[PDB]
Structures are given as structure tokens and as C-alpha cells.
Design a protein around this ligand. Structure first.
Ligand SMILES: O=P(O)(O)O[C@H]1[C@H](OP(=O)(O)O)[C@@H](OP(=O)(O)O)[C@H](OP(=O)(O)O)[C@@H](OP(=O)(O)O)[C@H]1OP(=O)(O)O
Ligand SMILES: O=P(O)(O)O[C@H]1[C@H](OP(=O)(O)O)[C@@H](OP(=O)(O)O)[C@H](OP(=O)(O)O)[C@@H](OP(=O)(O)O)[C@H]1OP(=O)(O)O
Ligand SMILES: [Zn+2]
Ligand SMILES: [Zn+2]
Lengths: 454, 384
RNA sequence: GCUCGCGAUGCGGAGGGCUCUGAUAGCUACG
RNA sequence: CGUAGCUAUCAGAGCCCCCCGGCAUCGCGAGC
């Protein structure tokens, strides 16, 4: 018991309360203390829990670590261990995303502050942790209804927080490319550089870290948290509710006329999508035509962390992958929990998804069931908006600069097919999942991308 | 004495309460604190001397969604009547082992070889369920109070609420109708905060009145067993209880051989028990004849206070089943459906039971009472 | 008879804070 | 040999606070 050990090692020490937040099941307190001058702090739904976490950080920073559970240990990154110790990096990206969300929700007082899952991307440009910069913040836990599908890219299909955070990261990447291409003097401020292999690549030591308030839905969450000590099957998000179901071993692909006749939309679980990002990269196909693949360096979970299950879901399940195109690889990012894990909130999920990217003046609210904003307009993150930004970048880069030839792009799906290497890596990933017995990836009907900007 | 229905009701209530008292140091143990008491009593003849208390239990809570076990080590539902059925299952396993021990021991077993294959109860062996209050759901929800003589019977029998399948809801109050277009529960969804739904006790008892009390696994060895009587120690309402236990699904059809829609005696007691003051205990006691002592389980975690699995958990029952299965010659099994040794698949080997369960679900659906809400499938996907 | 909407009065598992009693455990101080 | 004080846990009893989504009774409006 950290409070007991700190109270006996430093008998005269006294704890200091700060301020409570939320209400009922979502309420949480923040306690602080000052032993030998350091300003230790912790948090929990009840003050005695926050008390123990503040005393825990105090005992760790002034003495040694407590009786840490083995599954709670973090599988360290396969390479690139430069952003200090993994727990300090985890707690830093976690507090940064929570604080940016508090700024975007007027100190959690706005109606959109109530949420189940919170997500965000953090960028580090150097060895020091002071250099962190929040890139995107999002919330969401629902998917578009089958009847609200857009045949011209105006509706978001998946609004789970981590998915929306990646789309916001894509908005930041388009901004950085335009930042480099709009002026010669601004090239030093961009995160990109021209690559010796053609196109662009990230500047040295630029890293993105993903934070989710809970383990990603799907395979990463199929374990019993209270009995730690097993089949990485692919799963699809179910319609009418949170949670996933394994993909059927004998199921035909989605049809556009069938999503409105009987079959519910089958979106892949977030766990499978992050493994997919660990192979083909987080930039998607269109951005690959301009830049080299980008991968997350870390995956920080605010709750439901487990090293065996999360590592099995993020990459160990598809270690049999092979013959990847050059630059592509099986990412093995740092996986870690946090010192102040969130408590479970038993209750119904919100119908709205919140999203924000650095440089935006405010958050964007989306109705996850319809894939559009509360007043029926297309989202900044929708396919059509992304393709619009991509077209803007395509009209400024010389044809020789492109990593894949694609003169006069028109229909969205064809521009995606122009990324031959990304498509090849995606094919390798699909065969890896099949060869491992985890099932075949479910793809949405092609009519979903059969649209031109015109 | 003889067994005039009210005589029987009073006898079983006195026996279950008395046995609980014996087990709690004349109700002086800390574990004697209870809101709801349940039990199972066995009869053999007309002589009340032959009455036998089989199990006794207490509890009014169910598992916290975060504590679900993917190894079958946690009790999911600690409502007293549910725990009492599980304790009876332990008794049934023990009785099969008694039959299998030797030719001499078989005479004492409540089981006999069945001419239809496997085993059945010896003639006039009966089980009686006691609950100190009306089971939650359809029997309880429309009148959670002691009946009074000037109170008219249900004045709105035709309301659609009447007879509906209902679920306990995690951290919620009361019970709820299954929703329209009922959503499949998932393990990861519950872990993230989707509230765990559990079928009400009224619905579970109706289930037992079709598929029997022994469950699928025991049905691989034995023919369906039914309660002969259902005795409530308080809040008895004849019309509500009769609907809940069987009348609401009188539309059931195509049951497999030996299955039936069972209509046991329903009765209150002459001296109804009282409401007990006190915060309801977060724990649940269970005991089966032959056990030295009660076992105390934290209902929220589904485990004992030191985190050990209950003798009633899925894993423990699967272990009992495997031991009996290893002793029964193949030609005596009631089903010859071979299944991989994972609890879920072993349950699937009980083909006729699964069919009866399906007929039950359809009966509810066709009557307009909703669709049965199952646990996430991952719950039963474990092996020993 | 029922269904739906609004109102009113009631009935039946969670989270948080505060306070009082007991038991266990560790630590002080004083005579 | 005592007393007093501080913690940490459990165990129980009170003051609340905030939920949850059903059910009963009655009223009003509408439909079948
Ligand atoms: O971020 P998501 O919501 O998961 O959207 C992705 C993303 O689609 P967009 O970038 O066009 O929005 C993928 O695009 P790329 O990885 O190709 O850049 C696309 O993959 P494909 O074009 O390779 O099919 C995939 O589609 P699918 O689910 O059919 O695999 C689709 O996922 P959702 O349709 O679930 O949104
Ligand atoms: O009512 P309980 O005593 O809690 O146990 C039952 C029992 O499962 P266990 O015997 O494994 O404890 C049912 O199985 P059978 O005995 O009828 O074979 C099972 O239903 P299934 O057979 O379909 O698994 C049902 O759970 P569910 O209906 O949700 O699947 C489950 O009750 P709980 O899930 O409420 O614990
Ligand atoms: Zn998800
Ligand atoms: Zn009940």
C-alpha cells in the first residue's frame, strides 16, 4: 500500500487535494503531495485511489518501484528507443492528450466532454520530452449505419476514437507537405525532407505516438483483466452497439445494394486496423504516392493494458508476414499502460465523435451513426475532404517528385490504385492473416470509392 | 405427515431455513446476514421424514462486467435461486459417481439405468425449489409487495409488459424488457463499459421448466429433470407467478422426446417471511448436501474473498463432468456426439437439449415476449 | 381493452463525498 | 504495565449526493 509506505517512511508528510472533475460513474479526483520538494500527483475516481497513485509516484521517484504486476510491463520498441524511459513517455503523452481535450472542451464543461473513449496523436521531434506537441485529439466509439453510406465520400464510416485520430494525423501530414511546398524558407519548418529514393520522407527523429483511453476494440481486448497470466482472429464491429465479433470463415464481400437490403455494415475492429497500420503504415495509400511509409513509435493505453494480448493484436499474430515491398516492415512499436489508469464507466456510449487537429480553431462534432456533423454536413475527415487536400498537394509537386506515377488523377479509387507498393504491402498483410488462420479481411463495396471530385 | 400442497410448502420452507440456521451457527455467523434465501429439497415418498435439504444459498447481485472470467472461474449470477440450482447440479454429479462406484453403492443412488439409454431418477424422487421471495422479472416486477386481501388481481393482464423476457442490468435498477432488435453482447464491448445483461430469474426458471434443471452437460448422462413445486416464502402472487413460470409460453411446440412444458405446484407459505433490514450483503453463500461447510462468494467478483474459484463455477462443473464422463461406458451415453474438449463444444454435444432450448427461444419470440439474451460466446471458449 | 405522448405520485443495482463504532496491522509520544 | 495520538486496511451503522430504466397508480391528449 503506497500511502502506508510513504506515511511511514516520511511520517509527518501530508497529502494535498486539488480539484474534482466529472460526476457519478465518470467522476475522478486528483491528489498531490510534496515529499523532499517534488510535486508528486495522481488520479482516480475516489480520492483514496488518487492518494495511492500520488504516493506511488513519490515512492518511485525518491526510492524504488512498487509491487508491479507482470502483464502491466511494457514490451519496449524493437528499435528507436530515444524518447526517454517508456513510462515517462507514456505518462507524458497521456497527460498531453487529456490536457488538450480539456482545453478543447472548455475545461471538460462542454457537452461533448462526456465520452467513453478518448484518443490522440502526439509528436516528438527530439530526445527531450519537453518537445512534445499534440497533433490530434478525438473521441468516438460508434460506426456509420448501413443506410447512411455515401456513394461520393461525404460520410465517415468508422468513428472510433483511434480511427478518427489517424484521419486527423493525415490532415496534419497534408498540412506539412503544403508547408514544405508553399515556400523555400518554410522547408526547414516542415517535418518532411526530400528522400534520396524520391518523393518525401520524415525529417530525422520525428515520431508519432498513439494514445487510446482503453485497449483497441477487437483482439487486443479479449482477455480477463482480473486474471492475467489467445487466438488473434480478425473481428468486425457489430451494428447497433459497441464491441466486435469474429469474421466468419465463409462470408462473401459486402455489396452496395446489400448494405441497404439486409447485411449490416462490416467494419474491421480497431485492433486489426492498428495492425494494418503497423504493416502498411499510418499514411494510407494516397499519401504514400508522396511520402515514404510512416509508423507509430508507441501505443499508450489509458486502461485495459496487457502486454501479451496487446502485443499479439498489434503484431505478433502476423509475424509470418513476408516479401514486403522496400521501406515497408512489420512495425513493433512501444506498447505501454499508464500510471493513472482510467476506471470502467458502465453505461451507454455517446452518438457523437469529436475530432481536432493542430492548427484548427475548434473541435468538430460528428454523428457517428450518420458519419456527418450534427447539421448534416461532410466532415473534415471524410474521404472527399481528404482527396481534396490530396489533389491540392498533387497540383504543386512536379511529376518527377511523385513516388508513383499518376498523371491527371480522377476517380478516387483509381488514384488509390496508383500506389502500387502500398497495394502490394496490403496484399502481403491480407495473405498473412489468412495463412495464420485469423480469417480474411473484410472490404467495403467498391462503389464506396467510385466517385470523382467533380 | 402427508402432503397437502400447503403442508408441503410449509415443510420445505421450514427445512431450508432450518438447514441455513444449522450452517450459520444458529444464524449468529457474520455470513448469516441475507436478503434472499433459496434452497432445493428432495422428497421420495409421502412421509415428511424422508424430506432432504439438497442445497441452500443466499445472494442478490451479479458479476461486475470487468470481472468476467475467460476460464470459467467466476460466478456470473448470485441471485439465491440461481446459486441453489447450481448447487443441485453438484449433487447430481455426486449421485452419478455414487451409482458408478460399485454394484452395492448403486442401490443408494437416486439414479437408475434408463430403458431409453443413460440414466433417470428412481420413481417418486422429486425436487422442490424454495425462494424466500418472488423471483425477479415477470413474477416479481408487477407487484414487489406482500399481497393484501383487498388487492384485486392484476387489473391489466393484456398489457404488453406482461410476460416479457427481462434482464438484470449491470449497475442499473429493476429488470428490463429485451430491446427491439436485441443487440448481441460482446466481450470487448462489456469490458469497455457496455452494461452486462443477465436474464431475470423468472425467465431462467421458465427455461428450467422446458429444458430442465440439469443443464446441457448433465443431459449428456441423464434425462431431463424438473422441479415438482416452486415455493415462495413472501410476495407470492398466483397469477403473476403462474404466467412467469409456464403459462406465458404455452405456445411452445416440437419439444424433443422426454422434454415437456413443466407446470409445477406453485404455493406461498402460511406464515410468510419478512423483509430484512440492512444493506444487502455483497456476498452469496452456497452449500450442497455432503459439503462440510458453506462457501462464501463475493457476488461482484464471482470469487471468494481470496480470489479462489467457486465449487459452482463453470470450470469446476466442467471438471465434475469430465470425471463422470471418464467413468461412463460409451454405450451408456445418451448422446454419441463427439466434441472437442472445450466447455462450449461439450455443451453442443447435448443435441436434444440444444433443440429444446431453441424451441423455448422461439416460443418467447412468437408470443411477442422478446429474444433471449446470451453471454458473449468467448465466455465458454475454454478448456481444462 | 390496448398502444402512443405529456404530467403527477410512488415502487424496485451502481458511483462519490462526509460522519460514528469495532477488529487487525505498523508507528510515535508520555509516565 | 498503562494511556493518548497518527496512519493503513478491512467489518458494520448513519448524513447525504448523483445516477440507472423499468413498473404501479391517477390525470390529460391522440390513435387502434
Ligand atoms: O480510416 P478508416 O475509417 O479505416 O478508412 C479506411 C481507409 O479509407 P480512406 O482512407 O479512403 O478513408 C483505407 O484507405 P487506404 O488505406 O487504402 O488509404 C481503406 O482501404 P482500401 O482503400 O485499401 O480498401 C479502408 O477500406 P476497407 O474497410 O474497405 O478496407 C477504409 O476502412 P473503412 O471503410 O472501414 O473506413
Ligand atoms: O443460469 P446460470 O446458473 O448462471 O448458468 C447458465 C448456464 O450456464 P453454466 O451451466 O455454464 O453456468 C446455461 O447453460 P446450460 O446449463 O443451459 O447449458 C447458459 O446458457 P447456454 O447453455 O446457452 O450457454 C447460461 O448463459 P447464457 O444463456 O447467457 O449463454 C448460464 O447463465 P448466465 O449466463 O446468466 O450465467
Ligand atoms: Zn474500435
Ligand atoms: Zn433474481
Amino acid at each position: 500500500n503506497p500511502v502506508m509506505i510513504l506515511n511511514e517512511l516520511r511520517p509527518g508528510l501530508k497529502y494535498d487535494f486539488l480539484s474534482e472533475s466529472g460526476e457519478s460513474h465518470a467522476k475522478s479526483f486528483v491528489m498531490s503531495v510534496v515529499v523532499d520538494g517534488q510535486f508528486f500527483e495522481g488520479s482516480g475516481r475516489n480520492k483514496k485511489l488518487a492518494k495511492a497513485r500520488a504516493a506511488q509516484s513519490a515512492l518511485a521517484a525518491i526510492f524504488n518501484l512498487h509491487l508491479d504486476q507482470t502483464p502491466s510491463r511494457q514490451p519496449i520498441p524493437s528499435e528507436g528507443l530515444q524518447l526517454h524511459l517508456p513510462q515517462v513517455l507514456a505518462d507524458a503523452v497521456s497527460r498531453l492528450v487529456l490536457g488538450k481535450f480539456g482545453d478543447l472542451t472548455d475545461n471538460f464543461s462542454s457537452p461533448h466532454a462526456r465520452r467513453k473513449v478518448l484518443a490522440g496523436v502526439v509528436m516528438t521531434t527530439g530526445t527531450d520530452v519537453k518537445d512534445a506537441k499534440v497533433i490530434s485529439v478525438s473521441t468516438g466509439t460508434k460506426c456509420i449505419n448501413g443506410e447512411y453510406m455515401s456513394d461520393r465520400g461525404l460520410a465517415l464510416n468508422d468513428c472510433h476514437a483511434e480511427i478518427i485520430s489517424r484521419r486527423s494525423l493525415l490532415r496534419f501530414l497534408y498540412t506539412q507537405l503544403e508547408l514544405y511546398l508553399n515556400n523555400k524558407d518554410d522547408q526547414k519548418r516542415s517535418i518532411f525532407q526530400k528522400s534520396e529514393r524520391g518523393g518525401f520522407r520524415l525529417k530525422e527523429n520525428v515520431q508519432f505516438h498513439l494514445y487510446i483511453s482503453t485497449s483497441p476494440c477487437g483482439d487486443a481486448r479479449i482477455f480477463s483483466p482480473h486474471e492475467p497470466i489467445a487466438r488473434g482472429q480478425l473481428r468486425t464491429k457489430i451494428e447497433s452497439g459497441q464491441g466486435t465479433i469474429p469474421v466468419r470463415s465463409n462470408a462473401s464481400i459486402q455489396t452496395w445494394d446489400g448494405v441497404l437490403q439486409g447485411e449490416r455494415l462490416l467494419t474491421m475492429s480497431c485492433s486489426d486496423k492498428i495492425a494494418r497500420w503497423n504493416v502498411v503504415g499510418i499514411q494510407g495509400s494516397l499519401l504514400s504516392i508522396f511520402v515514404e511509409p510512416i509508423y507509430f513509435s508507441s501505443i499508450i493505453l489509458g486502461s485495459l493494458y496487457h502486454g501479451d494480448h496487446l502485443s499479439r493484436a498489434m503484431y505478433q499474430r502476423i509475424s509470418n508476414i513476408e516479401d514486403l515491398p522496400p521501406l515497408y516492415t512489420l512495425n513493433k512499436p512501444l506498447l505501454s499502460g499508464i500510471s493513472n489508469a482510467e476506471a470502467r464507466q458502465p453505461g451507454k456510449a455517446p452518438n457523437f465523435s469529436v475530432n481536432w487537429t493542430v492548427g484548427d480553431s475548434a473541435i468538430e462534432v460528428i454523428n457517428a451513426t450518420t458519419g456527418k456533423d450534427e447539421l448534416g454536413r461532410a466532415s473534415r475527415l471524410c474521404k472527399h475532404a481528404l482527396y481534396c487536400r490530396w489533389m491540392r498537394v498533387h497540383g504543386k509537386v512536379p511529376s518527377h517528385l511523385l513516388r508513383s506515377k499518376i498523371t491527371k488523377p480522377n476517380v478516387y479509387h483509381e488514384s488509390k490504385l496508383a500506389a502500387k507498393e502500398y497495394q502490394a504491402a496490403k496484399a502481403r498483410l491480407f495473405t498473412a492473416f489468412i495463412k495464420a488462420g485469423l480469417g480474411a479481411w473484410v472490404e467495403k463495396p467498391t462503389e464506396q470509392d467510385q466517385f470523382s471530385l467533380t
